[PDB]
């Protein structure tokens, strides 16, 4: 009994197509992703294969303006158009709190949504009653498939679920529910959920009954063979895992950002045991045409985004100095603002627990391409920011040796002189240059925030120590001569859309007062 399984995860509401590095689409001809594109390839498969399932494992809920505007309604009324079969809940699904999930999604969503390890108490319990289910018995062909859900116990630390929701241990809560499936003549049981590639594997091992595991949360990419883009694999697809009862349990995962659609042919015996498991995550390169009838319904909704571009987000009571002659030379308040928005945005909606304490940011002047004037009415709209951050990049998280960090800060002034926008506007860092000295021996003080230290202060940077820092993708990929980052970086995860990050910070702050406060000095 062959079962073709289409799976996605960590889609981060990238509804219109992106570029290879998961930023704003540039070359129309070479762009990837899209729910327009995805629909095409899913419909192709369904019109061919007889046994198909289309699953998601969460983090569908944060990322672009799309969400910032439609706040989960865009998700439902499109996932319902792709005709998904089940979905699990994510780190980011509770970013709008329970009712920013229960109202927009769980009610408006036309397909069952699972997690078994999440239980509610008190009055929320009645309200939410059976909008989120622990398992689902999803009939395919003349057979039936069980699908059991889970969600990371890390969720309360990376989201805002209120104090009425409990997050039980994945394994604990799955076992009793998988057992019930076998209690009701369901032999064929898929696990589906958002706890991270690591826990996905521990579900394989330690949960009897479970035949297949589909996960996400960790942006990890599995490929068998030659990677079809920059995506570095970290295991074969599927990833076989030796269970304790002694089964082969295939664990899968698409990258993220709705770039790759998961594709896995699973062949079963008469009694619900995995015998064969082969396939590779279908990349959505420009050679798949975007479906027209969806690209229409995209541009129908595009209009309410344009409307939001001109709406007042909040107000400044100070000039936001973003001019070349400011941010490219000395410490400008705009930089200080952005960096603060980058970090703050990260500590509410953290991607994984590895980044939930990130207090360091850097930003090249050559990404700050406009100031914002207060004189008018103090008003700040999206369009304002588009002038500041027109590159439509992202804010990515990188782990970096102090040695590497020092190097880049010397390359901040090695060729000082004219515009050369490599000068770094910092956040969670105190730096001092002495310009008299030799280019590449000018940083005289560099204190950084050590949060993995009881009460966090600025302690001088050690060249041995490893440092978890946020910065633009422009810099993670060695923009303005920063080859030393792209090379000597230890971890790199793509984050949310640059403009979207500020526009949120400003909305939730409502009044900004970004000052120049002596992060950067001379002598």
């Amino acid at each position: 009994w062959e079962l073709t399984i289409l799976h996605t995860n960590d889609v981060h509401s990238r509804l219109e197509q992106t570029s290879e590095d998961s930023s704003k689409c540039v070359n129309a001809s070479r762009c990837m992703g899209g729910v327009a594109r995805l629909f095409t390839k899913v419909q192709q498969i369904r019109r061919a294969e007889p046994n198909v399932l289309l699953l998601d494992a969460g983090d569908q809920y944060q990322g672009t303006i799309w969400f910032t505007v439609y706040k989960g309604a865009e998700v439902a009324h499109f996932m319902n158009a792709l005709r998904y079969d089940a979905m699990a809940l994510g780190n980011h699904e509770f970013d709008n709190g329970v009712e920013g999930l229960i109202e927009p999604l769980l009610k408006e969503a036309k397909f069952p949504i699972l997690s078994a390890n999440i239980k509610a108490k008190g009055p929320l319990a009645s309200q939410i009653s059976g909008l989120y289910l622990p398992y689902k018995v999803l009939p395919v062909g003349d057979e039936v498939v069980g699908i059991v859900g889970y969600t990371s116990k890390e969720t309360p630390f990376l989201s805002n679920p209120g104090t009425n929701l409990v997050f039980e241990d994945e394994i604990t809560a799955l076992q009793p529910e998988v057992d019930k499936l076998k209690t009701l003549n369901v032999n064929k049981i898929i696990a589906l959920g958002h706890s991270g590639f690591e826990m996905d594997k521990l579900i394989a091992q330690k949960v009897r009954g479970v035949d297949v595991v589909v996960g996400g949360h960790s942006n990890t990419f599995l490929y068998t063979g030659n990677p079809p883009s920059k995506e570095v694999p970290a295991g074969k697809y599927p990833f076989i895992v030796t269970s304790d009862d002694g089964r082969k349990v295939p664990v899968v995962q698409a990258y993220a950002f709705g770039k790759y659609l998961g594709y896995l042919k699973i062949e079963f015996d008469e009694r619900g045991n995995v015998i064969s498991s082969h396939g590779n995550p279908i990349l959505l390169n420009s050679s798949i045409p975007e479906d027209p009838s969806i690209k229409a319904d995209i541009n129908k909704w595009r209009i309410k985004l344009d409307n939001y571009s001109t709406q007042e987000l909040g107000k400044t009571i100070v000039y936001l100095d973003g001019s070349s002659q400011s941010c490219r030379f000395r410490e400008c308040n705009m930089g200080n603002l952005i960096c603060d928005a980058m970090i703050n945005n990260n500590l509410r909606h953290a991607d994984e627990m590895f980044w939930n304490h990130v207090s360091m940011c850097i930003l090249n002047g050559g990404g700050i391409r406009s100031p914002i004037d207060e004189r008018n009415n103090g008003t700040i709209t999206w369009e304002n920011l588009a002038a500041v951050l027109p590159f439509g990049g992202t804010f990515d998280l990188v782990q970096l040796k102090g040695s590497t960090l020092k190097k880049a800060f010397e390359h901040s002034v090695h060729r000082y002189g004219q515009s050369t926008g490599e000068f770094l506007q910092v956040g969670g860092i105190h730096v001092v240059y002495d310009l008299s000295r030799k280019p590449g021996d000018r940083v005289v003080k560099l204190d950084v925030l050590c949060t993995k230290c009881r009460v966090p202060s600025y302690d001088p940077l050690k060249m041995d120590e490893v440092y978890k820092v946020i910065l633009p993708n422009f810099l993670a990929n060695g923009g303005d001569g920063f080859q030393m980052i792209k090379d000597e970086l230890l971890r790199h995860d793509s984050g949310d859309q640059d403009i979207n990050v500020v526009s949120t910070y400003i909305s939730k702050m409502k009044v900004i007062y970004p000052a120049v406060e002596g992060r950067i000095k001379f002598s």
Partner: antibody
Amino acid sequence: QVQLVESGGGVVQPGRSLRLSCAASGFTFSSYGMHWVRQAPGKGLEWVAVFWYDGSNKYYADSVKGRFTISRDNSKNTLYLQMNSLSAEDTAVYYCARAPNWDDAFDIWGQGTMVTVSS
Amino acid sequence: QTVVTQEPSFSVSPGGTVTLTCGLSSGSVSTSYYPNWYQQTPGQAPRTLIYSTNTRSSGVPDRFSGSILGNKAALTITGAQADDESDYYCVLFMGSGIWVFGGGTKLTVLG
């Protein structure tokens, strides 16, 4: 293998309290929902009450709101229903049925027990 | 309160097709009410037939096949046996704990 038996059986005069038990066996009692459903002889089925998996959640029908009290004992794999302030419209057959955590469903049903309340 | 209204009685020829419907006094019935059908031999414990609206339960014959017709949840019996002469209860869960039965449809198949 799996079944549900109930206790109650008798006849009672209007007003008096009456307790109902439902002895379960042959499954992870610990896991499933547990309901009460009544059926007035000849008439249709009516939903009474429900107890979920963990305890926190108990719900009753508008018809027996706070007139009836449901209690689960997983220590003893048995479900209970406290029926205070009885009348003639409570005269019916009283089944306990298990629910899998699915659509909060109803796969297995008990033999049922008879509740006759008259002068 | 809201009444779940399902046909009061039906008759079918053996080896025939018949559909029981099950509707809601105020509003439509969708999948997201989790329809659910039961077979009761008059005076006996009601056995399950179909939950989810579509899904057959353990060891339910394939002849029984649930659906939704416009406003109402439905149950199609394609190829009736004499074995099927009993009472059939539809029932929906409008969440918060609220579960509500149908009046019951009495299905007759004699010859």
